[PDB]
């Protein structure tokens, strides 16, 4: 197994106010 | 197996309010 | 197996507000 | 097997309010 | 066996309030 | 005149992804 | 002319993203 | 005139992501 | 002319992503 | 003339990320 580069942003991103996750086991994600 | 670029935005995001997730493996993920 | 892009976005997005998953193994997933 | 580009946007998108998935194992999706 | 694409968006979008789903294998996709 | 509960929900709302609006003068109300 | 209570929620909102509106006297509402 | 209460919430509200308004006199709200 | 409690909620808010607005005179609201 | 009170919250708020205005003149609110 070879994880790589999972969420890739290319160019600038004005905010965040949400949930950004690369990689989850669990769950409950509520945005 | 060989993951790699699982969500990609080569243009710039203006903002982010929601969930944005690469992998899960278990659930609930609420918008 | 070999997984690449799988959610590409070519241009600018202008906000997010709901749920962008590239790849999931469970469900729940609520709008 | 060789995914790729499983969901393509060639142009700006004004905003995501509701669920963008590449690719899905489970169920239970609710817009 | 070889995806590609499977979805495509030539132009822009103005938005999204339902489902958009590359691939699916199990069910209960509700709009 | 008297105007009262122009719209009324006894039980509770999953979501709301359109238009409510309990009075209206002009026009042009696209869902 | 007397308002009340144009537009009335008895129970709990799950979310909401379009417009709830009570009174309006223009126009050029869009879902 | 007497405006009171326009928008009435008796109940919790999970989450905002659209537009409240009580009272509007212009118009080109987008939800 | 008498305004008074134009947006009411009566019970606990989640969160708040959008626009909450008693009352406005121009336009040009965006969710 | 005589306002007061026009965005009431009987209860807490656990969050707040938009924008919560009592009363506007001009335009542009974006959330």
């Given at each position: 197994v070879h994880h790589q580069k999972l969420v890739f942003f290319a160019e600038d991103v004005g905010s965040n106010k949400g949930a950004i996750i690369?990689?989850?086991?669990?769950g409950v994600v509520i945005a």
């Open positions: 690369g990689l989850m086991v669990g």
